[model samples]
Target: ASKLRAVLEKLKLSRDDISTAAGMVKGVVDHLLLRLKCDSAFRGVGLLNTGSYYEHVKISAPNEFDVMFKLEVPRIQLEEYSNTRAYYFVKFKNPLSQFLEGEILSASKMLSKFRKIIKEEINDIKDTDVIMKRKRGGSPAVTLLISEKISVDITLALESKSSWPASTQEGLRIQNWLSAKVRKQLRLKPFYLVPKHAKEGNGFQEETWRLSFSHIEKEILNNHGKSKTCCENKEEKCCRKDCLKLMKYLLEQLKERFKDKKHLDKFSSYHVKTAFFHVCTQNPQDSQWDRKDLGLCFDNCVTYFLQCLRTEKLENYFIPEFNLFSSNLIDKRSKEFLTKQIEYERNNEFPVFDE
Candidate 1:
């Protein structure tokens, strides 16, 4: 327990690191979204910095940032491209449709234009000392390599205020905890489609875009717990966020240790996060995750995730259709390996964090 506490202490980002990361994101957002406000494509777009940093689960220094720069498009049409109900092809409505004729607001074209503008404008940062890294082909983000190790993923999403896809209508299972009203408001808020691609060499040539619910996710984390004062100073705190951080760190450590297993590359922090959400749903009381028992609480979260991995049935919290842990995403050997690895950690007090 003491060892875990010491490791947790070491994992936190220093104040300087947090402020520096925030400054870099601010500079980039201002340069692209604000300074270029009058630019045709960039107009009506704004940046919402999401992901682990804002979620309060960021660990091991501030090396990554996820800022979704979304453009609000009215009278838009969506055609289902993926069964996940999260990916779609966007179209304009009526007279405006004629303006976008040639390529017609396709994910590839929009991302290309944003990249062009970003590559040019990010240079305007001048002496703040940030450089645009080579963008990955299938990745939806505009990467900025700040210094040597830190990078920010700026994703461009098209926002539509229309109803969420059919797959998500039954998801976001917050009614019993956060009530139906909160869930309804979140559903009404815009849904986003990002310019991410399907896996390469899958014989699919099209740049299939993905749906993002990061904003709703951010709100849920901030306002977590059944009571309004769940994590507030006035109330007894819960170990939800702390448990999440420990799980994230554990996954990172496992990846580094088992990087040779190419199949494990598909396993990401998102899967662990999804597992955490499911655990919270099953155990909705604050007492289930008391902050005073962080060690046991973290172990419980990890054990829940291992059980999911062992059963090979982690469902996407938002899109129930998408099973996060199926043969499609992981093979038997890799699944067993992870099950053993996690069990070892639970039984042995997580030696990974020590190193």
Candidate 2:
């Protein structure tokens, strides 16, 4: 019990630390936005803070950030570019297409230009000590190392006013969890496509853009729980977020212990999140995750996730058509090994985090 408390405490950040980090990141964002403010195509572009930090479930310090520089492109058209239904190609309408001279505005080209712009702005940062990292091939974001302990990813995204993709139409069942009004409000927001692509061949190229539901994700987390008063201050807390934090911590520790296993590196926090989402959907009642029984609730959540890993059947929460355990990401051997690792921890009380 003491050890669990210690682990939870270690994951927290003082409000002051959060404030400083937010200010530092905003400064860099302002610099980057000003660099592109003059371009007509980027007229309404704005940066949004997504990911775990904004979701209030971030663990183990608050250094990493995912900021989407979203540009509203009303004339954009999306076509399937991958079998997973999680990737697409965006092209301009007839009039806008001609405006781009014949170059199909692709993920690869735009990412390159975006990276160059960020790099140039970082170079011109005379007042700060920020340094941009070398472009990581196939990565959608331009990474900036703000000193040694902090880093931020600035991803360029195009927003569309069209309806949600068919694959995700039935997913994100937030009506039971967050109510109908919240769901309606979220659907009204524009969906974005980030410049992420696969390697050469294998039916995908560097020009493919991946669907991003990060804003919707943020909304769901912000409005998590079935009852209106769930997680309200001075009220009884549920174990939802706590279970997620513990699961994430366990995975990171497992990675360090089995770093040489190679395949384990492919397993990420997203997989954990996907499993948790499935769990939430299966058991949507807030009473099931009472704060007092967090230990038991957490145990069940871990077991449920371990079952998914064992069967190798995890799917992206928002895109059920997209398999999280796709062949390229995790192999049969890795799945078996991961099941064993998790089971061993469960049977022996998780010595991985022991001192």
Candidate 3:
């Protein structure tokens, strides 16, 4: 106690009242900061019910450490880089990586519990539960990497091989387990689903899955569908005809709609260049219906689509209604929702001819 007093005296403060005040000061700030980041003020919307436009929450997190907290997105395989962290990269690209940085920080206050509302949009989110109350997971922010480095360090890139139709049930089971595990790891309490979107557009990708992930494991297990805006994954490599067609259509729409703006002007440095990902199980190789000669068709649609779209004249563009045996399903069944086809080979034999 005397030595403590000496140190306090050296700093030129009254030692009479110092000894009692020393130990109490430890870790006081960190605890408070943790609360700000992991509390309801930074709410995360988990699920959605769109028809009524009423947003629903699947679960919420005080932070990322609660055992009950889970993120349901894709089902990716995980490889641990550290005991506390793992990488869950799906063989095909999943949607979590891009465009979620804002929401994570907006709701997590991840940058600095001390810092409040850097961007105007974040300030708006901080004030109201607009997203959670209005929409569950429609349009996710550009990424989960918020403005600060401290929060940026807290990320999990999981991996998974489970795709659609084959492992949907197993994939969901894994997702639930990871949700509970991730919150425990982050040392935060598992919160109830505040902004859940349960009836979100069935089949992921078309919807934003960022607002939904609460835990690291939750992020890995649940988010199993493909991504639509990641520039890196050209999975959808839209049929050259289709991809180009969309682009040209968009360009013409822009030109005709805003003729005064000179829409064709290319400033060259676009802020973003996003591409579509192939849906799970979309690889044509494994399907018996795919001909080996057809090879990889990602380029076919993409190339052909682009060629005809270049001159802004699609009337001459022709994508075979049925390239080899059958035709495009849409061409044949525009009014119908589904058309039956033997997508798989049954490997059966016919009966012998009668005498």
Q: Which lDDT value does model 2 have at 259?
A: 74
- Over the stretch 1-355, how does candidate 3's per-residue lDDT look in tens digits? 2322232233232343333222221122222223433544333212211200011111111111111112333433222112211111122222333323432312222222213322323344342221111222322221122222101111111212233222112222222322445424433322111111112234332211111123322332223223322223444222222222222323333334435754333211000001111111232222311223122332333333333223222220011111111121112331111111111101111011001
Residue 69 lDDT in candidate 3: 18
The number of clashing residue pairs in model 3 is 68
Q: Count clashing pairs, candidate 2.
A: 0
Give the Å error, residue 64, model 1.
Answer: 1.3
- Tens digit per residue, CA lDDT, model 2, 1-355: 5566677788787788788888888898888888866555566779889988889888877888888999888877777865658888777663223224244566766777677767877888888779987876456788897766568988998889888778888778767667778767777778899988854445447667888898887777776788767888656588788888888899988988887756587788888887887778777889887877777877888888888877778878877877778667677888888898899988887787677
Q: What is the lDDT of residue 250 in candidate 1?
A: 91
Candidate 3, superposed: residue stretches over 4 Å from native = 1-35, 38-280, 284-296, 300-355
Per-model root-mean-square deviation over C-alphas: 2.5, 2.3, 24.5
Q: Per-residue lDDT tens digits of candidate 1, residues 1-355? A: 6776787788788999898778876766677777556666666888887999888888988889889988788888776674545566666654223235354556766677778877887677776767788865557898888766678888988788899988787788888777889988889888888887544445542446777889888998889988788877745788788888889989888988887755467688989889988887877778887877888888778888988888899878888877878886577788888888888988887878775
| Candidate 2, pairs of clashing residues | none
What does candidate 1 score on TM? 0.91
